Design a protein around this nucleic acid. Structure first.
Lengths: 43, 43, 43, 43
DNA sequence: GATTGCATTGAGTGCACGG
DNA sequence: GATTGCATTGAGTGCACGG
């Protein structure tokens, strides 16, 4: 059910990822997953 | 300075990552980066 | 930064947790974390 | 039939789990269960 | 830039060859 | 019902003693 993948991100977008996941106590993989879902929704 | 990140995503979330990316004419890294900056906005 | 804890939940709330985390490709620990955060916010 | 679940939470998210729980006069399991049913609502 | 195999440590990540 | 130590496998969970 889980697949790996390597992405490239802006040194500033990644630094932001950090903070966000941190306050939400999430992993980047989870924060990303949350954000992806989120976005999908708002679409 | 751009940096790389190896993450793990749920097949279903990945599948939809692809879908959304195609339709937005962006790469996964790009899509993810959008959604990420988006969530930060939505608050 | 991470701490363990054992909770007790309704057979129906847990069954729901399942679905939700599943579609969001999240762990319960993550889904719960998301939901907790969420709630905090709406407060 | 009620069931048990051992989860892992980020200290900061746990700390705020406690805060919110106290103030709502509920147990963590209870709080978590609320928030969980809540998110499902918010959609 | 991207995909992946090798590797490790509490799946999610790093690293680097091969593209 | 809750906390925790023991245990395992891709931290997040199960299991069960002790409460």
């Amino acid at each position: 059910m889980k697949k790996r993948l390597t992405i490239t991100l802006s040194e500033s977008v990644l630094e932001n990822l950090e903070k966000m996941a941190r306050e939400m106590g999430l992993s980047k993989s989870a924060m990303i997953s949350v954000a992806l879902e989120n976005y999908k929704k708002g679409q």
